[PDB]
Write an enzyme that holds these catalytic residues in place. Structure first.
Site, short mmCIF file in Angstrom:
data_model
loop_
_atom_site.label_atom_id
_atom_site.label_comp_id
_atom_site.label_asym_id
_atom_site.label_seq_id
_atom_site.Cartn_x
_atom_site.Cartn_y
_atom_site.Cartn_z
N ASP A 32 0.82 -1.20 0.00
CA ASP A 32 0.00 0.00 0.00
C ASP A 32 0.86 1.25 0.00
OD1 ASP A 32 -1.93 1.90 0.32
OD2 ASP A 32 -2.39 1.39 2.42
N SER B 271 -0.91 15.64 -11.95
CA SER B 271 -1.18 15.28 -13.33
C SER B 271 -1.45 16.54 -14.14
CB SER B 271 -2.37 14.33 -13.39
OG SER B 271 -2.79 14.07 -14.72
#
Length: 330
Positions: A35, A199
């Site tokens: 994770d 992004s």
């Protein structure tokens, strides 16, 4: 040194991925959920409340000659999906894919929430976010990667998750045969303890690319792609019959649909998520309403590039002095 381990979907939907991890001496192999959105290595154990164990493999520290109780240490964690676990702490030897760390903090669960109990395939979590998020008290502990880093050939790990197929986690090297084209690197902020990056925009299907900054985290422990409501609405508007359902808890779509792809930007580069990756199947057995793999982050408070996004790429988690993230198509 290096390590290389295969990671395998837990079910037919790729709800999560498990990777075998050797703990203790002699080795006890547990299948852990790696994770990159948390920083605790915790396991089902001989200390876990019996009624909360249902099929998981447990770590038994009393059977490990290298286990040592970390005196006074406790831990307690709550995840974004509302699940939680807590317990005490041992140090022991931990190996992943041939890479060994001695003195790793292994957090032994005394209690786990129902979602963990109900998932027989996940024996614990191995956190790969920054050690500043580790929950051990009163002395915070380091992640497996943080402990391994100085020994690694290069201070990196990579995630190469499969779509409905096994994939690979590598430590200490970049497998140049595992991706196509080049790797595009992008800046990371560690301010919130995550692999947080921005992004450069998105496209839906064959549509034009929208240049827009989307701050979010690369999180292998989250199944879906969580993005701003504007972006998600634009995606689902291209699917006939798709709608947001408050009763179901997100966007659903007719199982008869063909889903468009979703592209996200990494600098000037583009990663394309095929439409099929966005299908999470019937909302309940036999239903013709299917759950979407792109969902709104509104009210999460952060955008999350979970497995839906990451499995479309070869992803480099660069733990150099100034960390960065790399993405390649594959």
């Amino acid at each position: 040194s290096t390590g290389s381990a295969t990671t395998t979907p837990i079910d037919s939907l790729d709800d999560a991925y498990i990777t075998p991890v050797q703990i203790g001496t002699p080795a006890q192999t547990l299948n852990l959920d790696f994770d990159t959105g948390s920083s605790d290595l915790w396991v089902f154990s001989s200390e876990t409340t019996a009624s909360e164990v249902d099929g998981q493999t447990i770590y038994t520290p009393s059977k490990s000659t290298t286990a040592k109780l970390l005196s006074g240490a406790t831990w307690s964690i709550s995840y974004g999906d509302g699940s939680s676990s807590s317990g005490d702490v041992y140090t022991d030897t931990v190996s992943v894919g041939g890479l060994t760390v001695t003195g790793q903090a292994v957090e032994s669960a005394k209690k786990v929430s129902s979602s963990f109990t109900e998932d027989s395939t996940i024996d614990g979590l191995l956190g790969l976010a920054f050690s500043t998020l580790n929950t051990v008290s009163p002395t915070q502990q380091k992640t497996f990667f943080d402990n391994a880093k100085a020994s690694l050939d290069s201070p990196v790990f990579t995630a190469d998750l499969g779509y409905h197929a096994p994939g690979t986690y590598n430590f200490g090297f970049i497998d140049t045969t595992a991706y196509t084209g080049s790797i595009t690197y992008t800046a990371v902020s560690t301010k919130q303890g995550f692999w947080e990056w921005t992004s450069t925009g998105y496209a839906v299907g064959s549509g034009t690319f929208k240049s827009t900054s989307i701050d979010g985290i690369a999180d292998t422990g989250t199944t879906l792609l969580y993005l701003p409501a504007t972006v998600v609405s634009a995606y689902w508007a291209q699917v006939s019959g798709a709608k947001s359902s408050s009763s179901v808890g997100g966007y659903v779509f007719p199982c008869s649909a063909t889903l468009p792809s979703f592209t996200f930007g990494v600098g000037s580069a583009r990663i394309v998520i095929p439409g099929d990756y966005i299908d999470f199947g019937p909302i309940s057995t036999g239903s013709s309403s299917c759950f979407g793999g792109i969902q709104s982050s509104a009210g999460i408070g952060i955008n999350i590039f979970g497995d839906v996004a990451l499995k479309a790429a070869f992803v480099v988690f660069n733990g150099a002095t100034t960390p960065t993230l790399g993405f390649a198509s594959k």
